[PDB]
Amino acid sequence: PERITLYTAKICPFAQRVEIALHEAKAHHNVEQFQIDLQNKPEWYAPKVNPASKVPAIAYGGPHVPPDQPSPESIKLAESLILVEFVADLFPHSHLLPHDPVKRAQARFFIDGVSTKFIPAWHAFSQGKSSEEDFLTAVEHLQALLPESGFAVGAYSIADVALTPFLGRARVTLKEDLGGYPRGEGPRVLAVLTSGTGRLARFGKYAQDLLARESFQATFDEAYITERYKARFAD
Amino acid sequence: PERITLYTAKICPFAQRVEIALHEAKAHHNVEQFQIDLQNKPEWYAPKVNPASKVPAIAYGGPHVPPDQPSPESIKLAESLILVEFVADLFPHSHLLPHDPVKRAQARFFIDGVSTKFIPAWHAFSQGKSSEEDFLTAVEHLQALLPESGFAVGAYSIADVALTPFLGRARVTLKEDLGGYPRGEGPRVLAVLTSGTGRLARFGKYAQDLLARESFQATFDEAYITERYKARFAD
Numbered sequence: 196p197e198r199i200t201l202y203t204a205k206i207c208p209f210a211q212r213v214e215i216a217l218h219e220a221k222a223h224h225n226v227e228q229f230q231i232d233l234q235n236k237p238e239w240y241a242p243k244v245n246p247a248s249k250v251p252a253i254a255y256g257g258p259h260v261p262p263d264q265p266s267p268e269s270i271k272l273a274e275s276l277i278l279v280e281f282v283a284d285l286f287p288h289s290h291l292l293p294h295d296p297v298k299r300a301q302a303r304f305f306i307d308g309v310s311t312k313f314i315p316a317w318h319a320f321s322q323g324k325s326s327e328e329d330f331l332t333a334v335e336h337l338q339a340l341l342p343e344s345g346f347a348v349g350a351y352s353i354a355d356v357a358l359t360p361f362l363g364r365a366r367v368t369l370k371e372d373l374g375g376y377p378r379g380e381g382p383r384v385l386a387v388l389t390s391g392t393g394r395l396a397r398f399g400k401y402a403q404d405l406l407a408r409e410s411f412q413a414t415f416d417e418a419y420i421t422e423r424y425k426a427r428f429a430d
Numbered sequence: 431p432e433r434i435t436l437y438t439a440k441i442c443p444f445a446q447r448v449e450i451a452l453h454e455a456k457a458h459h460n461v462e463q464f465q466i467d468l469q470n471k472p473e474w475y476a477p478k479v480n481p482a483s484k485v486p487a488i489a490y491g492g493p494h495v496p497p498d499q500p501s502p503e504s505i506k507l508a509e510s511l512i513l514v515e516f517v518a519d520l521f522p523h524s525h526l527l528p529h530d531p532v533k534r535a536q537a538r539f540f541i542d543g544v545s546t547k548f549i550p551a552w553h554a555f556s557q558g559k560s561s562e563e564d565f566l567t568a569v570e571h572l573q574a575l576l577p578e579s580g581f582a583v584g585a586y587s588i589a590d591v592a593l594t595p596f597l598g599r600a601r602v603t604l605k606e607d608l609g610g611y612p613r614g615e616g617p618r619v620l621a622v623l624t625s626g627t628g629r630l631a632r633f634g635k636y637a638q639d640l641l642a643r644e645s646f647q648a649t650f651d652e653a654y655i656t657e658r659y660k661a662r663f664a665d
């Protein structure tokens with residue numbers, strides 16, 4: 196494939212999706228990363244890379260240029276789920292996208308559930324807007340899609356990529372009691388989520404497997420995430 | 431491919447996405463259609479086909495069975511965008527999915543814009559919730575993605591599939607003054623949208639092309655849609 200510049204941020208779970216994808220493709224050392232400070236975005240980012248002014252975004256092909264001076268000739272692509280599929284499409288030996296058409300749809304249907312149920316339900320619960328049961332209900336929906344063993348469609352796929360950055364950050368929010376509920380309520384919810392027992396037994400094992408995946412650990416600055424998350428709550 | 435049963439409804443734009451896709455694949459006469467009455471859903475639909483109780487849904491493979499008695503052995507798939515990609519994946523000679531990885535991402539990015547901007551903005555405006563300018567702004571976003579000529583990425587693709595059912599129904603809503611604004615306001619907005627002139631000139635030509643596409647006309651019961659839409663407004 197042509198040269199890739201990835202515009203990312205350690206803080207952003209949507210961006211880690213693309214970092215995980217590149218790492219699964221064992222291409223993480225072939226691409227140039229540039230970190231965007233989301234509180235102080237470069238003035239060139241929105242007009243030259245992504246008018247939505249969000250990470251991730253990729254500059255694909257074109258001449259060799261400094262990453263803070265992206266070329267007009269590179270192809271600009273945004274949206275983490277789309278970029279994950281682009282990475283699968285560019286590096287087929289990654290096996291991110293299953294060959295079988297049925298298995299692809301099931302991976303993409305799981306992503307739909309990550310997108311329309313888990314993430315919004317996590318957002319609402321971690322901010323104190325909704326109930327614990329609303330969050331657990333959304334997780335049980337995903338659990339019900341899981342096969343008896345393995346990842347979302349057996350073999351690791353884009354489905355697991357979509358979920359993992361939000362799972363690992365939720366773990367941090369809950370382990371450290373940053374979810375807006377009294378002390379110990381956070382850690383109790385983590386155990387429900389990841390113990391491997393109880394109503395979310397199967398999801399708990401799956402969660403253990405997602406967070407052990409090499410690609411996740413290598414692209415997850417837990418110390419940086421945990422430090423930022425405590426400061427945010429402190430306000 | 432194995433046998434396909436498609437659970438659909440003339441009224442539903444999300445379902446027409448799959449009908450358009452099948453027709454582009456020149457496979458519309460190979461699949462069994464079953465019409466779901468969304469006001470009186472069969473009792474077997476949710477437990478045996480799609481627990482979300484929505485159309486479209488596909489039963490894939492399995493034995494030959496009556497469509498109102500779907501087999502446990504067929505693979506059940508739901509979500510119109512995912513089913514459109516499944517159809518592209520099953521019938522590659524349809525050319526619904528471009529070969530080039532960059533062109534696929536651009537088609538899918540357009541769909542993201544159809545999904546996150548056009549459809550929600552149309553929904554809000556057609557019900558009287560938001561402003562005309564909010565709707566036109568969302569359309570101009572899509573316009574800005576269009577190439578100088580052709581469909582969303584040049585060649586017809588899944589991108590155009592995603593949009594067309596909502597465009598053709600919006601046309602009906604607006605032509606017939608069913609949008610909640612005084613008489614003539616509907617028809618004025620249609621001309622803005624489809625004239626090929628003005629601020630939405632390029633989109634207007636594109637709209638002309640989407641609504642002339644054979645696949646759209648063959649899967650669009652305009653008389654049935656127009657009759658239902660007038661009755662709805664009449665309440």
Ligand SMILES: *SC[C@H](NC(=O)CC[C@H](N)C(=O)O)C(=O)NCC(=O)O
Pocket residue numbers: 206207208209210233234248249250251273274275276
């Ligand atoms: S997490 C950082 C933000 N990213 C996104 O919101 C990406 C979401 C996209 N829809 C996607 O790609 O999935 C970000 O960059 N936000 C900018 C900001 O600071 O508001």
Ligand SMILES: *SC[C@H](NC(=O)CC[C@H](N)C(=O)O)C(=O)NCC(=O)O
Pocket residue numbers: 441442443444445468469483484485486508509510511
């Ligand atoms: S238009 C008919 C309804 N379909 C959908 O809502 C499908 C949306 C999906 N998210 C998709 O596939 O894109 C439907 O069947 N509604 C059931 C009802 O009557 O409420």
Ligand SMILES: O=C1C[C@H](c2ccc(O)cc2)Oc2cc(O)cc(O)c21
Pocket residue numbers: 276277280303306307310311353511512515
């Ligand atoms: O069709 C979809 C929609 C789904 C999605 C659903 C809701 C949402 O808010 C965001 C994404 O994401 C996807 C991700 C993919 O890799 C491939 C797909 O075909 C889809």
Ligand SMILES: O=C1C[C@H](c2ccc(O)cc2)Oc2cc(O)cc(O)c21
Pocket residue numbers: 276277280511512515538541542545546588
């Ligand atoms: O990644 C996405 C998300 C996009 C989408 C975005 C927002 C939304 O609400 C629904 C869908 O739909 C898709 C449709 C596809 O064919 C392939 C894709 O990769 C995607």
